[PDB]
Point group: D2
Chain length 389, copies 4
Amino acid sequence: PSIVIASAARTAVGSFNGAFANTPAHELGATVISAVLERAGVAAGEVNEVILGQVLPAGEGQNPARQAAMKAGVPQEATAWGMNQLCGSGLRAVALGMQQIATGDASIIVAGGMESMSMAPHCAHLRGGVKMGDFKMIDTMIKDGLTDAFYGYHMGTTAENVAKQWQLSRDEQDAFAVASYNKAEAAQKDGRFKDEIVPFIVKGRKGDITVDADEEIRGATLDKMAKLRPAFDKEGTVTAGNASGLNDGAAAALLMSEAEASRRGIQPLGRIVSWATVGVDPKVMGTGPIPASRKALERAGWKIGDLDLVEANEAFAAQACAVNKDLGWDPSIVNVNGGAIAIGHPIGASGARILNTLLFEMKRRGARKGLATLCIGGGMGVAMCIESL
Amino acid sequence: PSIVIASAARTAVGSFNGAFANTPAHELGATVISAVLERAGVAAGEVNEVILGQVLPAGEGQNPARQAAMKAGVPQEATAWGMNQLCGSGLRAVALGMQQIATGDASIIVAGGMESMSMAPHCAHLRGGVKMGDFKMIDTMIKDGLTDAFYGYHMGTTAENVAKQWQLSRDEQDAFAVASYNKAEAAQKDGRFKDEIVPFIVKGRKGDITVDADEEIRGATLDKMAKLRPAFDKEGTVTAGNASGLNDGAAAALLMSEAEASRRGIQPLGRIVSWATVGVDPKVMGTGPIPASRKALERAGWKIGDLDLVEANEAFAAQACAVNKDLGWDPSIVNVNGGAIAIGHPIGASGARILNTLLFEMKRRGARKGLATLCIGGGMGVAMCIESL
Amino acid sequence: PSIVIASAARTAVGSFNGAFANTPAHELGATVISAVLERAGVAAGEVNEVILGQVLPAGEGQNPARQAAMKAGVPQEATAWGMNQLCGSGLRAVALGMQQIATGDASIIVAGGMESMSMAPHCAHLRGGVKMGDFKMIDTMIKDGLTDAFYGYHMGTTAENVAKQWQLSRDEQDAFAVASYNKAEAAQKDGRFKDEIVPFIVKGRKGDITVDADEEIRGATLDKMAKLRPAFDKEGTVTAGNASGLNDGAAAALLMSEAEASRRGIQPLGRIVSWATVGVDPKVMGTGPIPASRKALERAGWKIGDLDLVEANEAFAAQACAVNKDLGWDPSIVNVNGGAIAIGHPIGASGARILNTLLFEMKRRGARKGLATLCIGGGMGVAMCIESL
Amino acid sequence: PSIVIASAARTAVGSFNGAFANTPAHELGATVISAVLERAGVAAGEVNEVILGQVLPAGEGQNPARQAAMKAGVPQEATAWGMNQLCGSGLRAVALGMQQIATGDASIIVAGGMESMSMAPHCAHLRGGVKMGDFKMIDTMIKDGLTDAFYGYHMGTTAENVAKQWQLSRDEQDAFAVASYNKAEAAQKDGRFKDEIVPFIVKGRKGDITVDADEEIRGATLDKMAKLRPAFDKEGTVTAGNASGLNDGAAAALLMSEAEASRRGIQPLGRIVSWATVGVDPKVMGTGPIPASRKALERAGWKIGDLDLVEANEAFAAQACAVNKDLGWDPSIVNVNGGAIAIGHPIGASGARILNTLLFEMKRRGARKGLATLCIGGGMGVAMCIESL
Ligand SMILES: CC(C)(COP(=O)(O)OP(=O)(O)OC[C@H]1O[C@@H](n2cnc3c(N)ncnc32)[C@H](O)[C@@H]1OP(=O)(O)O)[C@@H](O)C(=O)NCCC(=O)NCCS
Ligand SMILES: CC(C)(COP(=O)(O)OP(=O)(O)OC[C@H]1O[C@@H](n2cnc3c(N)ncnc32)[C@H](O)[C@@H]1OP(=O)(O)O)[C@@H](O)C(=O)NCCC(=O)NCCS
Ligand SMILES: CC(C)(COP(=O)(O)OP(=O)(O)OC[C@H]1O[C@@H](n2cnc3c(N)ncnc32)[C@H](O)[C@@H]1OP(=O)(O)O)[C@@H](O)C(=O)NCCC(=O)NCCS
Ligand SMILES: CC(C)(COP(=O)(O)OP(=O)(O)OC[C@H]1O[C@@H](n2cnc3c(N)ncnc32)[C@H](O)[C@@H]1OP(=O)(O)O)[C@@H](O)C(=O)NCCC(=O)NCCS
Ligand SMILES: [Cl-]
Ligand SMILES: [Cl-]
Ligand SMILES: [Cl-]
Ligand SMILES: [Cl-]
Ligand SMILES: [Cl-]
Ligand SMILES: [Cl-]
Ligand SMILES: [N+]
Ligand SMILES: [N+]
Ligand SMILES: [N+]
Ligand SMILES: [N+]
């Protein structure tokens, strides 16, 4: 059997404490589920399962994936579950949903990711009780999302390790970040994000607000970016400018077999050809996409030169430069409409966000072979190959 | 391809704020991964992926599944991710790992679940700030694990709905709970839990303690059970005695193809024949196993009368009576060594705990066809069919 | 013995979460201590004791009164302590300092109050530990400052009881509030607050800001006041417009004997003639100033007609109207420069704030006999009689 | 005018998280107020004001002194306020009440202190909001009670400075502590504490408990004292044995003029002859009683040799040895029934606790001249001279 992506959608990527500062992740995920259903011409009553990746679900309630599926209109007879592979959760959920149809355990799968880093709470274990002295309230976003569990420092410190081993100057990282900002603003002004973005209605107290544009896409200049101070190492190279930010958003895609889409008269966005996930040293988790993309290309029977478009998530300017320089693919086909440095980085949703960007750009310019990949905290990477029609 | 379970292991189920009151969940899972590897004669360097279900990972760090795999000795090249389908997470992870080998994306999978409900913290969203007035610190165990997101009451109130619609008296629920307590002591005194339980060393400051026995198994009398007060509805029927408790523990299983085990000279515990997951109304989530077991039996081509052993998770005495009475299978083969009312109910790990109990129960008495099933919060159920040899 | 007030000073009354949103109370009090010393021509080495009233000292450290005296320059040989009689703390500290010199145990006393309601934290008793369930983080400002400990409702509900017993319509309360708002702008625009206000420099990270004007004086119109919703009772009459707000500030006064000021050639602002404090029913604590002012006038040998100026703190429009009609003094001499409804109500500092306003306004228009009074939560009141020169 | 102490009472000193682990301070104070009235034969309607020292009132509600007076039976017409001079609050309140009657502003005063260090909560300022990162929950007991606001270290570090400047060996501090432990047990077993202790009924959920004995008095030997670890400096001399602990309790005294007691036929416990308070360097606040006692004795016209009994609060073994060696008074009359090292140290109540012990021990052995004194954090001391009647 062969599994195709019939439709795809994503919300606008909101800034930290921005438009989605008080919107739970399951409400964002409910909109993308309803969107991919209307775009594919498939009713909610036909969905078998909903697989949504999410990294920071504390305080949101019992299984936010079920909450997003029910709110979207999926009937109670269907099932839904959440998964956590950190930054690759959004893309892995699509591969997992593809495996559901491959084994014959499902027919129609809605897979993607959702993350609301603004809604992440502060926690502390208090069952034993603090009889004396002070104690710390731990930020779940920093602890459970952005801190390496083995070495104790932020993910930005891992990018510093990649910067030293690959010898990437501060100017090369800033130049890469300004290039990502300019491609993202050019794509937004030309309306190349309108096809993938579904508008989200933020029910506020003083009237409702329609969010349909990524609010992190600003105008970056090389001089103001070079004046920023390093955010992690006191004498490092990774700053707030050349590193992705904290963001909210959701993205998903509707999966079915190629024979199913042909029977329904659906023109799919692409066929999932292969996928792969490999682990690396946690010290340099940014190098994850390098062996993961090679394994996916090997499973598909493709060479690196056969790729027409590439979406590599830009967690940091340092890790992105190293991935492009090791794999050696043409950078003019990698992130043609910008990356996470300018658009945003919702952890659980980034895997499906770049897949949304990849799918519509392949259809818009007639590409035949595409690949999406991300780096994962703890030393992992994930990649997937898509073929047109 | 055909997938077999080469080995299985589980830790002792600890009581709430008991032996594992300060032990993180990933430390429990690390012991089960090492156990299933040593029991099967498979080195850690051969593991491709580790899939562990977990419901309450807040405050534990980046991807506790990766932390458990690394501490067990699995090399960095392998991958690991967590999943959350509430109480069915432990069993669903085994089906997902089974799908990894079926699609050809892996060869050896360690799948299971881990949960430390004692380590669940209290949280509160504090980024926006509380300008005036009091606010609530939310227990993540109650909110994200035991409270229905749609109707707002505890999972025990759902058992009250099942008790009312099925008209299950308080005496019938207490008699079912006392029967489960007595079966657990008979199995424990006869040492029928020694094969599945792997001893866990709690490294303390005042010497190390060896935990190798389920700490929830006590002695229950019918009169002491009748004196208990209802724990959820002020005039209900579900009490602390006839309901499962809050517990810590972990369980896992080593997966490989049937041809792989034959090449390695391994005699597997059983072959995974089929599996299924179906959704129901959240009001009566305890009825989850009823359509899930029929769909799993239908996928395997089995009738209910063909089953030799059955492990049905006893979330509540009311919901367990309803599942046995609708499916109508012989209760003398269901939970032969007791259930969660006496052993414990670690949410993310119960799915693999009853699978461990089922597998070793099939090997000791030569059963041929078995089935394990659980109910899931939010209105879902999961089931799996296992065949000996 | 005869005690005189040689000098007095106060900071500008800041709004809740306003200019002093992050300024500790002892830093505000330290500037007022330096001011009353410099204005009276008395060195810091001559201060015997510092008495500062404060209601919300949680989280500020050991004895904030000692911190304010030390930072102001008072030597270590002198002593300092805090007291708490709620809203009357600022005025009671002046009477207590007067008693220190009267009994001969001191010669020079700096007495007043300081309060930073913006810096009040949220607290919770956690030594025993919360084994299960949610718990409340208690706002110390609401609990320890604004909630009646006997009946459990806010101080605004007490104003509702006083309004009902005196039959004060909502329009009569709104008209009284607009009268104080209009008087406050007349005094501020004419610079009648510059003599009492000492400028405070808010040392920030992005430059320093000089605060020298009450930021709560905004100006109320009769129509906009009538459109506001009741803030306490769902069908009441006390709203945010006709009720005082939450504020930060500090105020103090330098005390010495009449012979000492004559010996140093110092001209005091006024002589303390008498003082009194009486308790009332907590349900109607707003009626506190009625018996307290009569008891003070009785001790001084004065009639109500002998008073030239009166400063009665306007905690609420309802409680203030009842005091004016019961005592029956000329309203044209009561709060001639506005009240707490327009200026603000820092609880621990209000007692010295109205004393500061009274002293300088008596000098501005040549008044001879004045009286200041406040109402106290829990059912108390305090009053003091002052004679110029 | 001459002021006498007509009656006095105190509760048993409870251990940290002990018998009074859940008893608010105002409930402890309410029993002491009812006791001093019942012991003197004075109705509650004759009390003019209640002055109670308290250091940790966070979370207890509006003016805990008013709460204690109301529950004790004092009518609403009387007033009540709290004061805070740290460890000298209990004794300073007695001196303040003496000044109320001396100036003629009151006739009957109930003065003392109350403290419940077990009920002190953890707090944190959260109005501005924590937008990113971890934050600390501050222990109000350590921050607002036991940490010097100027140098940042615990009060125990201050005792190390006094021990070093006076060169007090570790053996001399332990020998002084065991001497107080042995003197305290002789008083308790001989029933010399029964007259001052008033029984307190702890109404609990599992039955009521009668507390009528200081639970901190344990058996101390020289060997076990030498085996303890230093509690502050990693290589210091102050340990948990030779330092006072955290405790709960309350104490008060009934004040009136000497002519008033003669008119009511009351036999007073003693006459307040003089009092004094002096400040010292915060690094060595334990030396506070040295200049404070000299200032009190000179005001009373007494020589050190004229004293018959002395109660010097033993905050630490180091600070007590320095005070006894500097003043040079006979140690056989100093703390004849033990000190705070064995009985306990409730901060707000210790000033009245040693006053209670001093008054009854002077009446028990016919002493003529006595003195009580304490050291205060931040560098202060307080002393009072008492003459028996
Ligand atoms: C990098 C990071 C620490 C930034 O934290 P931050 O400093 O609080 O973010 P800020 O928005 O406040 O940036 C601070 C400063 O940089 C400036 N700045 C930010 N982006 C800029 C840009 N693109 N161009 C120019 N200036 C910029 C801001 O204006 C601000 O200056 P100011 O405070 O004086 O106004 C945070 O975004 C982060 O942790 N990123 C990592 C995400 C991650 O790990 N993802 C997973 C990877 S696998
Ligand atoms: C039991 C529960 C309801 C909370 O009640 P609880 O008070 O914490 O239960 P506890 O054991 O701590 O104390 C309960 C009382 O019942 C008694 N009790 C418990 N089990 C008993 C038994 N088997 N026989 C006799 N008495 C028993 C306890 O000793 C205690 O008596 P006590 O008041 O004298 O100490 C909690 O375990 C729960 O929420 N369970 C449901 C979670 C769930 O739904 N899991 C599945 C998810 S689908
Ligand atoms: C603090 C208090 C102002 C709370 O009100 P709040 O709504 O939470 O805070 P705000 O004042 O900012 O909101 C007031 C609203 O009325 C408006 N308002 C306030 N004063 C106004 C005035 N004088 N004229 C016209 N409109 C006014 C405000 O702009 C605001 O409108 P908004 O909804 O658009 O923001 C007040 O109700 C209170 O509780 N005071 C207690 C003080 C006290 O008890 N002291 C002890 C006395 S013994
Ligand atoms: C000294 C202090 C740090 C103790 O902290 P602590 O760790 O809770 O001390 P604990 O009593 O709980 O435990 C001390 C140990 O020594 C033992 N011990 C204590 N006192 C002892 C004694 N007098 N004789 C023999 N053994 C003793 C205890 O049993 C305990 O045994 P453990 O090792 O099994 O725990 C604390 O009480 C303190 O800060 N005191 C100073 C308060 C203060 O400032 N007072 C002056 C105000 S100006
Ligand atoms: Cl800018
Ligand atoms: Cl001058
Ligand atoms: Cl003097
Ligand atoms: Cl000035
Ligand atoms: Cl009088
Ligand atoms: Cl008694
Ligand atoms: N950025
Ligand atoms: N139970
Ligand atoms: N106001
Ligand atoms: N002690």
